[PDB]
Amino acid sequence: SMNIYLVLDGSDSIGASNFTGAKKVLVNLIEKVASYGVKPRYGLVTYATYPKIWVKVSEADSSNADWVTKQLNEINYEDHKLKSGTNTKKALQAVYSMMSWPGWNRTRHVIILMTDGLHNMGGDPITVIDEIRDLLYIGKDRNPREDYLDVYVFGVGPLVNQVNINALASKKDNEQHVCKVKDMECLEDVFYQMIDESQSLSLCGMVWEHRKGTDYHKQPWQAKISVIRKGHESCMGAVVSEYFVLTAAHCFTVDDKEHSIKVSVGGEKRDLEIEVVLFHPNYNINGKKEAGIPEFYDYDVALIKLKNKLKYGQTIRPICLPCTEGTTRALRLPPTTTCQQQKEELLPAQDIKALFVSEEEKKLTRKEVYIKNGDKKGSCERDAQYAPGYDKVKDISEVVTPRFLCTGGVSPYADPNTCRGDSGGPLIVHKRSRFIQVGVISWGVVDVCVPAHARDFHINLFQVLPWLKEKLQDEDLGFL
Ligand SMILES: [Co+2]
Ligand code: NA
Ligand code: NA
Ligand code: NA
Ligand code: NA
Ligand code: NA
Ligand code: NA
- Domain assignments of the chain as residue spans, ordered by start: 1-202, 203-319, 320-480
SS3 151: strand
The answer to whether the Cα torsion of 468, 473, 476, 480 is positive or negative is positive
What's the Cα-to-Cα distance from 215 to each of 223, 234, 440, rounded to whole Å?
A: 12, 18, 20
- CA–CA separation, 244 and 474 (whole Å): 11
Which ligand is closest to the CA of 196, given by its number?
A: 4
CA–CA dist 235, 422 (Å, integer) = 6
Parallel/antiparallel/unpaired status of strands 261-265 and 222-227: antiparallel
300 counts as catalytic: yes
**Cβ within 8 Å of residue 133, ≥6 positions away:** 139, 149
Cα 402 to Cα 458: distance, rounded to the nearest angstrom:
11
Q: Which of 109, 217, 250, 458 is catalytic?
A: 250
- Ligand 2 centroid–CA 66 distance in Å is 5
Q: Does domain 320-480 bear CATH number 3.40.50.300? A: no
Q: Which ligand is nearest to the CA of 210?
A: 5
- Ligand of minimum distance to the alpha carbon of 313: 4
| Residue 250 designated active-site | yes
- β-bridge mates for residue 236, sequence order: 224
What's domain 1-202's superfamily in CATH? von Willebrand factor, type A domain (3.40.50.410)
Spot the catalytic one: 423, 433, 442, 456: 423
Question: 37: CA distance to ligand 5 center in Å?
Answer: 22
CA distance 368 to 458: 15
Residues with Cβ–ion distance below 5 A, ligand 2:
66-67, 70
Whether residue 163 contacts residue 117, with contact meaning beta carbons closer than 8 Å, is answered with yes
Q: How far is the CA of 339 from the centre of ligand 7 (A)?
A: 10
Q: Which fold has domain 203-319?
A: Thrombin, subunit H (2.40.10)
CA distance 27 to 217: 24
Residue 20 annotated as binding? no
What's the Cα-to-Cα distance from 44 to each of 6, 113, 155, rounded to whole Å? 5, 10, 18
The answer to whether the CB of 192 falls within 8 A of the CB of 212 is no
Task: Return the biggest CA–CA distance within the chain.
Answer: 88
Q: Do 1-202 and 203-319 agree at the fold level?
A: no
- On whether the CB atoms of residues 247 and 440 are closer than 8 A, the answer is yes
Rounded to 5 degrees, φ, ψ at 254 are -65, -20
- 169 CA → ligand 5 middle, Å: 28
Contacts of 206 (CB under 8 A, 6+ apart): 35, 36, 200, 220, 317, 434, 435
337 is in an annotated binding site: no
Which method was it determined by? X-ray
Q: Are 57 and 41 in contact (CB under 8 A)?
A: yes
Q: Is 115 annotated as a binding residue?
A: no
